[PDB]
Amino acid sequence: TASIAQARKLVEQLKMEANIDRIKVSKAAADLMAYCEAHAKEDPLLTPVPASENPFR
Template sequence: QVSKAAADLMAYCDAHIREDPLIIPVPASENPFREKKFFCAIL
């Protein structure tokens, strides 16, 4: 039964690979966790 579970897990991973942000990074414009760039100007 372990081999069937492993096969099911591999099939699930293969089916959802396009939605995995670790495989295909999220574009910077859509990433809510991107670093914000703050500019500080001293005159």
């Protein structure tokens, strides 16, 4: 039966997937904030670069 093969695979897939370590959203959101602020000065799209050096005149 094709149904029994799929169901066995799905349970095995979920069983291994559920056994992972989850980092609290407070830390995860902090890391996203830290990366954006750290590289904000080197983002030529959020803060436009002076026209003297951009290639698109």
